[PDB]
Design a protein around this ligand. Structure first.
Ligand SMILES: O=C1C=NC(=O)N1c1ccc(Cl)cc1
Ligand SMILES: [Cl-]
Ligand SMILES: [Cl-]
Ligand SMILES: [Cl-]
Ligand SMILES: [Cl-]
Ligand SMILES: [Cl-]
Ligand SMILES: [Mg+2]
Length: 347
């Protein structure tokens, strides 16, 4: 066991192993507080996150376990990984605090596209990396659920990593003129049907459009204004898709709208590479059953310069059976403790 030292930073007690030095507060959401630090063992600048109230309820205890299981599993060049996890506790009886350590991220995709469009070669490389990461994530039957520019880290060499997996956002966070909703697939924005991995491909289409134009594709002022923007581009549904909407009330609302045909995407994305237009048409499909998958998209001719099927790996199998399990707070806490002490660091 390493030696720990204590300090107070912005009214918060931080107790961390001696290897982590020069701690500096960076942010604090509702799930914890974050400090930048220097890791003397690896030489990396790192983010250290102290979870806030990790075991305050059954819901919160299960969410802590879910987050740690997911971060321990992810081992791919285009996905955030876990460098370390620690607790100052010396036994399960005194276990209360969880700290997570990752590589410190600089700019996100917003700070690169803010009010600005990129060249086609840059769009090819950035979207290729998102899809390479997504092929890996989806091969473990994981759905990200919250892909958007602020959840994509980018460096000066245009290299990209996916972060901030959806751990299951409030009603108020999705209300109004907000980027938190602009990248969401229509079937989950209005709870038409059950989530599945195709929702992530819709988000990639929205991101790719915004890189090509410099502007948000569907900047709706509320859920219904956004749906109207979506259907104007991709057309109103046929009876095939209407059949698959379990909400009778949602079926009734869609049929209240005047019918609209799918628009010509070459007249929307003026001047774009025709191969980019073709790929957008295959991602931005209303019926989720018919969207292109990440593995299929990597083989599309838009990525001929980068595609290498011997260098696009899949993930080890991932056991999610805990998600349908009903446990008490102290049982979720015990499972989490076991995962902290069994962590093996990367090479
Ligand atoms: O799609 C592309 C590729 N280059 C562009 O300048 N666009 C683009 C299209 C429409 C608007 Cl309104 C703005 C930008
Ligand atoms: Cl140490
Ligand atoms: Cl990483
Ligand atoms: Cl503790
Ligand atoms: Cl964003
Ligand atoms: Cl597993
Ligand atoms: Mg985020």
């Amino acid at each position: 066991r390493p030696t720990f030292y204590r300090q107070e930073l912005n009214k918060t007690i931080w107790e961390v192993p001696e290897r982590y030095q020069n701690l500096s507060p960076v942010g604090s959401g509702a799930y914890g507080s974050v400090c930048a630090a220097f890791d003397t063992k690896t030489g990396h600048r790192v983010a250290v996150k102290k979870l806030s109230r990790p075991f305050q309820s059954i819901i919160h205890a299960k969410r802590t376990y879910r987050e740690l299981r997911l971060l321990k599993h992810m081992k791919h060049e285009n996905v955030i990984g876990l460098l370390d996890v620690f607790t100052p506790a010396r036994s399960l009886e005194e276990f209360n605090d969880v700290y997570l350590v990752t590589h410190l991220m600089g700019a996100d995709l917003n700070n690169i596209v803010k009010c600005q469009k990129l060249t086609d070669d840059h769009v090819q490389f950035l979207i290729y990396q998102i899809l390479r990461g997504l092929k890996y994530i989806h091969s473990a039957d994981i759905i990200h659920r919250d892909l958007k520019p602020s959840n994509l880290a980018v460096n000066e060499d245009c290299e990209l990593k996916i972060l901030d997996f959806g751990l299951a956002h409030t009603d108020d966070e999705m209300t109004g003129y907000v980027a938190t909703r602009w990248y969401r697939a229509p079937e989950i924005m209005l709870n038409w049907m059950h989530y599945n991995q195709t929702v992530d491909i819709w988000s990639v289409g929205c991101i790719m459009a915004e890189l090509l134009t410099g502007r948000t594709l569907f900047p709706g002022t509320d859920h219904i204004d956004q749906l109207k923007l979506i259907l104007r581009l991709v057309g109103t549904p046929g009876a095939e898709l209407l059949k698959k909407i379990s909400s009778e009330s949602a079926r009734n609302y869609i049929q209240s709208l005047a019918q609209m045909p799918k628009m010509n995407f070459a007249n929307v994305f003026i001047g774009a590479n025709p191969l980019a237009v073709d790929l957008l048409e295959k991602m931005l499909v209303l019926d989720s059953d018919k969207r292109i998958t990440a593995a299929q998209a990597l083989a599309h001719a838009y990525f001929a310069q980068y595609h290498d099927p011997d260098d696009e790996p899949v993930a080890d199998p991932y056991d999610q059976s805990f998600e349908s399990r009903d446990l008490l707070i102290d049982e979720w806490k015990s499972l989490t403790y076991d995962e902290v002490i069994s962590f093996v660091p990367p090479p």
